[PDB]
């Protein structure tokens, strides 16, 4: 089970080690954020903002703006436009786990809306590991089945003649996506698979998939071979490590969003306007999103103030609600859910809600209706289940544009204000518009982001919406990440308080123990499995169990890594490690104290 795990380098021998050389870029520590754990709110905004801008930075080798990546984008838009020209029997599927699956969902929503607005039959669908419940809840373990990915693809593709399958996995990791790409390659008469991720192919996961005979790396290598015949495409730009190691929802999520929106817009422009995709025109769009970074981070002082407000509510416990209008609600939902595994948050801590119409978005909304508190997300859920129980310690962030129903915004804000003073808004406007006076009075320190008009004949209005969604994503992801960092939930720039919710996260947890303890691979595996299964003692059957067993047992547990790490550092029992942790103000402080 652990053959691919490299032995821990000896003390002082980490420099130039084979262990370090094998760390995927998506898992690497960012050299600019080693002191993220102790940074104040303003410094966290600066660090995370710098990292967010790295996706656009043009060595120029395989970067997002490189000729190589742009050429692949032109080729993929060429294949997509062939499907858009033949709606009868055509389909575009986007797929992934976690944030990658939620990005697949968002792309399908955006592009089906684009098609509906033009009076065309919608041709997009999404596949998210675990189904619709995964859009709103933490169900990361569902991506560990390649067969689940294949079964879901077969269901949506049944009866179709030509299917583009865009498999998204930031780490080139998810078994759900590997299975789909592999099966697409078995029938190139119908399927055109496109793999989107942010590692070199040689860094794709090569550990065994429990229900598949090829590893992700083997599938990606087969795609490279098929790309020579234009039968598959690997779209894997270099963006560099995340500010919080392995936090694929951040740069990886942003780069996924911009890469796909740009190439899909180019495919639609080819069909509708007759202008073929080009490197020049892809860059004009990508650079518009680059400008959105400056526009957004010009609000760094207010982003830091909001981060502190959210962190105060969490420290007291209170809950934080991110209430977004229309598609900004999807961005809000995407933010809250990731806090569960990233920081060990409870599902009640940070939750996003969508105000407005969601009727054409979900393919199986029955999987969500009256399913429990972990599945709330709608306008009705917010008004009927959340609002009546709001207290003075809760924070509510409202995200909207000046084109939204501002009477409805004002009504809901006033209802919330009766329960808590901790309200703030992120309002997007087009240069020329001003916020109604009653909203200026309700939000005297509103985060106002003003956007110049765009004059792209075809894509202008779509880009205007997309850049506001990206801007919202940067603000919310920086606020939620920072709010938890301020509470001592990370160590250096590593997710100390991670929940081991899937196999990728299990490997991250094991690697974290090797890195911070410096102890052997055997000792770190033993401590990790002992902490996961506690109070069940370790047995040979547990040591030999599939990783899925460890994930099932670990996924709802808190502080597994600091318990396993303190056990290694103090050479103590789990109960002694739990006592050490209980006596400290945070997991960050307990581990820093043990390391000193
Ligand atoms: O396949 P990937 O996009 O790398 O990662 C997929 C994913 O579900 O893995 C577990 C967490 O890291 C989630 O935040 C992440 O979206
Ligand atoms: Ca629990």
UniProtKB/Swiss-Prot annotation:
| One annotated GO biological process | carbohydrate derivative metabolic process
User: Entry's PROSITE patterns?
Assistant: GCKR (PS01272), SIS (PS51464)
Q: Does the keyword Manganese apply?
A: no
Tell me what happens on changing residue 403 to A.
Impairs inhibition of glucokinase
Cellular component, GO, one term:
nucleoplasm
Tissue specificity is: Found in liver and pancreas. Not detected in muscle, brain, heart, thymus, intestine, uterus, adipose tissue, kidney, adrenal, lung or spleen.
Q: Where in the cell is it found?
A: Cytoplasm; Nucleus; Mitochondrion
User: Where, in this chain's numbering, is beta-D-fructose 6-phosphate bound?
Assistant: 99-100, 169-171, 504
- Top-level taxon of origin: Eukaryota
GO MF, one example: kinase inhibitor activity
Q: Where is the SIS domain?
A: 80-276, 310-489
UniProt: beta-D-fructose 1-phosphate binding residues? 99-100, 143, 169-171, 338, 504
Keyword set, alphabetical order: Carbohydrate metabolism, Cytoplasm, Mitochondrion, Nucleus, Repeat
Extract the ranges annotated as region (Essential for interaction with GCK): 453-455
Sequence segments annotated as region (Important for interaction with GCK): 189-190
According to its UniProt entry, what is the function of this protein?
Answer: Regulates glucokinase (GCK) by forming an inactive complex with this enzyme. Acts by promoting GCK recruitment to the nucleus, possibly to provide a reserve of GCK that can be quickly released in the cytoplasm after a meal. The affinity of GCKR for GCK is modulated by fructose metabolites: GCKR with bound fructose 6-phosphate has increased affinity for GCK, while GCKR with bound fructose 1-phosphate has strongly decreased affinity for GCK and does not inhibit GCK activity.
What does the entry's domain section say? Answer: Fructose 1-phosphate and fructose 6-phosphate compete for the same binding site.
Query: Partners and quaternary state?
Result: Interacts (fructose 6-phosphate bound form) with GCK.
State the family named in the UniProt similarity comment for this chain.
Belongs to the GCKR family.
Protein name (record): Glucokinase regulatory protein
Q: Which organism is it from?
A: Homo sapiens
Instruction: Provide the taxonomic classification.
Output: Eukaryota, Metazoa, Chordata, Craniata, Vertebrata
What gene is it encoded by?
GCKR
């Amino acid at each position: 089970r652990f053959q691919h795990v490299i032995e821990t380098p000896e003390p002082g021998k980490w420099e130039l080690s084979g262990y370090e050389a094998a760390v995927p870029i998506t898992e690497k520590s960012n050299p600019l954020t080693q002191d993220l754990d102790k940074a104040d709110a303003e410094n966290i905004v600066r660090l995370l903002g710098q990292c967010d801008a790295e996706i656009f930075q043009e060595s120029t080798y395989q970067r997002l703006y490189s000729e190589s990546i742009l050429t692949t984008m032109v080729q993929v838009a060429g294949k997509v436009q062939e499907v858009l020209k033949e709606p009868d029997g055509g389909l575009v599927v986007l797929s992934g786990g976690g944030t990658s699956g939620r990005m697949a969902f968002l792309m399908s929503v955006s592009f089906n809306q684009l098609m509906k607005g033009l009076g065309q039959k919608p041709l997009y669908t999404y596949l998210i590991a675990g189904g619709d419940r995964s859009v709103v809840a933490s169900r990361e373990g569902t991506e560990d089945s390649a067969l689940h990915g294949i079964e879901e693809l077969k269901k949506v593709a049944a009866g179709k003649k030509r299917v583009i399958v865009i498999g998204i996995s930031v780490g080139l990791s998810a078994p759900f996506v590997a299975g789909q790409m592999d099966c697409c390659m078995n029938n190139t008469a119908v399927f055109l698979p496109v793999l989107v991720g942010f590692n070199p192919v040689s860094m794709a996961r090569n550990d065994p998939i429990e229900d598949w005979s090829s590893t992700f790396r083997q599938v990606a290598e087969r795609m490279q071979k098929m790309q020579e015949k234009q039968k598959a495409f690997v779209l894997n730009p270099a963006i560099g490590p995340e500010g919080l190691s392995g936090s694929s929802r951040m740069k990886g999520g942003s780069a996924t969003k911009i890469l796909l929106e740009t190439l899909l817009l180019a495919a639609h422009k080819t069909v509708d306007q007759g202008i073929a995709a080009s490197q020049r025109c892809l860059l004009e769009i990508l650079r518009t999103f680059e400008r959105a970074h400056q526009v957004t981070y010009s609000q760094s002082p207010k982003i830091a103030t909001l981060m502190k407000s959210v962190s105060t509510s969490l420290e007291t416990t209170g809950h934080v609600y991110l209430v977004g209008w229309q598609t900004l609600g999807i961005i809000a939902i995407m933010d809250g859910v990731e806090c569960i595994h990233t920081f060990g948050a409870d599902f009640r801590d940070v939750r996003g809600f969508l105000i407005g119409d969601h009727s054409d978005m979900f393919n199986q909304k029955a999987e969500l209706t009256n399913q429990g508190p972990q599945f709330t997300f709608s306008q009705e859920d917010f008004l009927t289940s959340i609002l009546p129980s709001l207290t003075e310690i809760d924070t509510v962030v409202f995200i909207f544009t000046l084109d939204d129903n501002l009477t409805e915004v004002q009504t809901i804000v006033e209802q919330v204000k009766e329960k808590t003073n901790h309200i703030q808004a992120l309002a997007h406007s087009t240069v020329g518009q001003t916020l109604p006076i009653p909203l200026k009075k309700l939000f005297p320190s509103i985060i106002s982001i003003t956007w110049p008009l765009l004059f792209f004949e075809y894509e202008g209005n779509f880009i205007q919406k997309f850049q506001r969604e990206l801007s919202t994503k940067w603000v919310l992801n920086t606020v939620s990440t920072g709010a938890h960092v301020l509470l001592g939930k990370i160590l250096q720039n590593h997710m100390l308080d991670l929940r081991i919710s899937n196999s990728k996260l299990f490997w991250r947890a094991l690697a974290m123990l090797q890195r911070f303890s410096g102890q052997s691979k055997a000792r770190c595996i033993e401590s990790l499995l002992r902490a996961i299964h506690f109070p069940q003692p370790l047995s040979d059957d547990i040591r030999a169990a599939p990783i899925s067993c460890h994930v099932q047992v670990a996924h709802e547990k808190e502080q597994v890594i600091p318990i396993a790490l303190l056990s290694l550092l103090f050479r103590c029992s789990i109960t002694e490690a739990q006592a050490h942790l209980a006596a400290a103000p945070s997991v960050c402080e307990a581990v820093r104290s043990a390391l000193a």
